[model samples]
Target: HQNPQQLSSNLWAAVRARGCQFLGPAMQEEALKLVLLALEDGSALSRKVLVLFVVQRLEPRFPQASKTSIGHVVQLLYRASCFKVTKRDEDSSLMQLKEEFRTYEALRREHDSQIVQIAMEAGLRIAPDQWSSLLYGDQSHKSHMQSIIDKLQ
Candidate 1:
């Protein structure tokens, strides 16, 4: 009740068995939506694990392309990367995220080998040159996922 929802081992087992393979078309969006929602309210560990899944599962381009077609998983990365938060500032709601994506920086540079490994994998999936700045650059440019989305286009 108080804490975020806990992820189960079966899902972990499924991911382990699947590796970076693409999901079936019938299941793709549904499966991605599950992890995207989990990133919002699941436990901290869940977010870390789901990030790996999201990065690996993303296709180089959209499954179906159109003018308005978008990559949902990539969008999830953007939302999880930076988004508005609500806090009470007098009578108004204020927005904020970790300064300079420091939270993601932790995953990028921390002692956890798996987290760092996933970060490297994500970097490879996107672009190595841009990954560093997009993730660790000063607060000047945000929306790290847009660059990846552009490449996918």
Candidate 2:
């Protein structure tokens, strides 16, 4: 809770590994607060932590947990990172952007469990998780997935 440097690398990971090991409700709330901060403006590591919390930690575990949950924040975390990968510094941003675009496309597709697959398959550019989230809508310039899709290229 001091410096980001001193923050336990396994702090969030522990939450995933074991749930609600709370000494008190106040402490539990503090943990959730950290998750939110990281989601809003933390590093690539934090983004990964949030996505795992939503996709792996929440959802299937409890039917009602995601009701108030901003589960899609991770996708937005994925989406908000919309910068062209021009410089070496830009490399990490593109991974999140491309993953967001794919997840949206997957959402627009055949079934629901497929959504988890998209979420899990998120950042692997190794097989070239294709830039197949192509755009072909009537309003080409609108602020829908078209904008998200356009920036991926």
Candidate 3:
């Protein structure tokens, strides 16, 4: 079996190359599994990429296909926020927090009511509309947000 990153990158690249807007309904079940695996990886970079990719690509395309995966992403975001103090490297932790916030913001925009409720349940500290800029505007300090948008589209 291929490593999870290889599998996910291949899936993302294929989707991009084919101009496929949505993963077919039948593929959703398996897609959710892959997403969960990606989200749970030890590397924060992998988690960040996976969460962003899922929100930008899969959520919009397959809104109802993977409710559980969506929830897991939100949960990961919540956990990531709390890592600010405990992580060994403050700079890396802070960056992770920002990236995770950006991901939460994306999901909150994609599914406002659901995200708000979930965030509240998870004890997160974000307002519903705060995510709007992260998804559509230029709140990100780095050019990476733009790059992420370009890749997704």
Candidate 4:
């Protein structure tokens, strides 16, 4: 990977290009690692992408993934929001600050599929056919997926 951004963008693009469809269990595991790494990056842009990736691409299929990494993501977000700086900008850092805060807030408040909304925002156009066996193959996962879908819809 050239950089974290490129790695993240590429991985995200790959996930999307696969139609954000039924990724295999192994693929989901790989995506989870990429997402964790992306979220750990200190850049706001990278964090935004990470947020989008979690809320959009991965969450619908794998809300458990969020459970796995949210504590860390929240820690990073807290640090970012409460950051103390000696510099000043005309626009104020609040724009980015609020965006991150809103993301966290939404995650906390919405039991629905914030994941679907995230995916939609990221420009994933999923077809019903794309859902396929991915949704039905795992009985244990059904409730999680259904819950997220209902909330998102």
Cα lDDT of model 1 by residue, 75-133, tens digit: 33334444344555564432332344334333222212232234333433333343333
Off by over 4 Å in 1: 1-18, 46-153
Best model per TM-score? 4
lDDT of each prediction vs. the true structure? 0.35, 0.32, 0.38, 0.40
Model 4: per-residue Cα lDDT over 1-153, one tens digit each: 154345335444543443342245444444444443443343343333444555556566566555335434433333333222223465323113333323433432231133345445565544333222233334445555555555566
Ranking of predictions according to TM-score = 4, 3, 1, 2
Q: Clashes in model 1: which pairs? A: none
Model 2 ranges with Cα > 4 A deviation: 1-37, 40-49, 63-72, 77-91, 94-153
Off by over 4 Å in 3: 1-34, 39-43, 63-73, 76-88, 92-153
Lowest lDDT 10-residue stretch of candidate 4: 92-101
TM-score for each candidate, following the candidate numbering: 0.22, 0.21, 0.24, 0.31
**TM-score for predicted model 1 compared with the true structure:** 0.22
**How would you encode candidate 2's per-residue C-alpha lDDT over 1-153 as one tens digit per residue?**
244323222332332232212212232233334344343342334333454554344445334344223334334223333312223453433222233333333333211122222323342121111212111213332344323333343
Task: Write candidate 3's Cα lDDT for 2-116 as tens digits.
Answer: 4444543554343333322224323433344444444434334434454565555565546764444543544433432422222444443312333342343343333223323
97 Cα displacement, candidate 2 (Å): 15
